[PDB]
Design a protein around this ligand. Sequence first.
Ligand SMILES: Nc1ncnc2c1ncn2[C@@H]1O[C@H](COP(=O)(O)OP(=O)(O)NP(=O)(O)O)[C@@H](O)[C@@H]1O
Length: 524
Amino acid sequence: PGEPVVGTGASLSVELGPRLLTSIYDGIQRPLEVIREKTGDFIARGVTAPALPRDKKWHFIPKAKVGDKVVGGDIIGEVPETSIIVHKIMVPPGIEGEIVEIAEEGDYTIEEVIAKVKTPSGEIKELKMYQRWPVRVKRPYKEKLPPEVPLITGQRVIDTFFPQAKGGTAAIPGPFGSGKTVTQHQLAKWSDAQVVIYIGCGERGNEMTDVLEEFPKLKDPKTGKPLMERTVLIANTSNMPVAAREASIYTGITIAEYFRDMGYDVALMADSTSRWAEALRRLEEMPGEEGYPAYLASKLAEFYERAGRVVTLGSDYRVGSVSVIGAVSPPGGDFSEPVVQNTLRVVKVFWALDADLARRRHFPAINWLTSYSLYVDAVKDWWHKNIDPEWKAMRDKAMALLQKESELQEIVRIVGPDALPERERAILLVARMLREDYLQQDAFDEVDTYCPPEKQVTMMRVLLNFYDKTMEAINRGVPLEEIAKLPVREEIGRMKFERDVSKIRSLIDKTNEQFEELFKKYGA
Ligand SMILES: Nc1ncnc2c1ncn2[C@@H]1O[C@H](COP(=O)(O)OP(=O)(O)NP(=O)(O)O)[C@@H](O)[C@@H]1O
């Protein structure tokens, strides 16, 4: 402990090595609960509790030989840490030279020196299975890559209309423990990140008890194994010092960056509740290294600035990412106050969970008019090249229809529906199908809980093709009443529950031909 200094010092750090996975920590990486700390533009203090166990024995597979040149981030061994995650043992940033000594394959505790590096000036550096890093300094990397690859969530509304990029920043309302919603949990378990760092914060009541003995019971749907085996929990209970809680997102993101550095995609999910900043009191009369108006607003930007997909340190070309999903729960839930405005200025994605959607049981209750993603153009080429060349045209078309529907519903609120032309009735019919057959998704269903990219575009094609055929039929004298009761419509309403994508795809031809029947019946 201690060893303290001037600046932003006291050396506030985290340990990084086998046994971060499955751990539950507080805001400064102690293995359970309660001790009181005090924060400042200067230092902070603690006392007793060991982050990574020194007694446990880890299997070390060497990945480098005596005589190898190494740089920061180079991978010198592998440690099978859970049944899901292989831990990658890396040279700490700043250390380079020749490997003069390295442990043979065997079992070792984390304090055992598993390698030695002779630096260029001849200093001999001793390497263990873990390393320490100041939580307040971003771990370094070679290059931060532009947003490009979507974080695939398997949730249609998000992946299609409001995509998250790997390395992106997203915000979502309210506490993660809210029982009104389940997308928080869908995101945690289905996103294609190998590792999840979860800061179960804003915890009061059952929030720290049911989060305790369900996560070990929780299953990783991709592997049957427990979700905890690829997760690190960081607790922010109400009985914790406001300084360890503050520091928790920094400890979390440092641990995220650490798994990023191995070549992993990692998702960092940060919880939040009500009224953190009444402890505020431009205006800074007595300042130091904390010029405190909305200085915190600039510091939040800085945290979110640590998200990204990067070419990592190391001598191999290696990419990893940290994508950030932050909860936003305003003081009164009025979404005008600081917490929301300060977050919404930095994040590139907002998923507007909407109490009115939930109340009418439209699930995922994501408002498709107030949500937005600034990654749509960033990710489109990945969809075009890998999944479907018409991904972006199709989403834009479906969105235009959602927007037309919304304009039409306003007008109909004023004058009612009796004067609606067939064409506008047809737009309402197909928008309703989009809403019900595509946006709505069943998280509780064994099929519809996850929707693969290939299934998403096929379902979209079935719907947009039905749109085209509807408008061309209207355009040919076929009454809307006849289209509304086309037998294929009910198969379209059920396609989300079909796991065979070729059967979903067959609905295109089946739509086409049923419409032909109408075209000939009405001699149209
Ligand atoms: N089958 C399902 N598939 C996906 N999500 C579901 C499903 N069933 C329920 N949900 C979730 O239910 C949520 C409704 O949230 P909503 O109540 O609108 O949030 P809110 O009340 O505005 N604030 P909060 O609940 O505190 O975050 C949606 O985010 C999710 O869809």
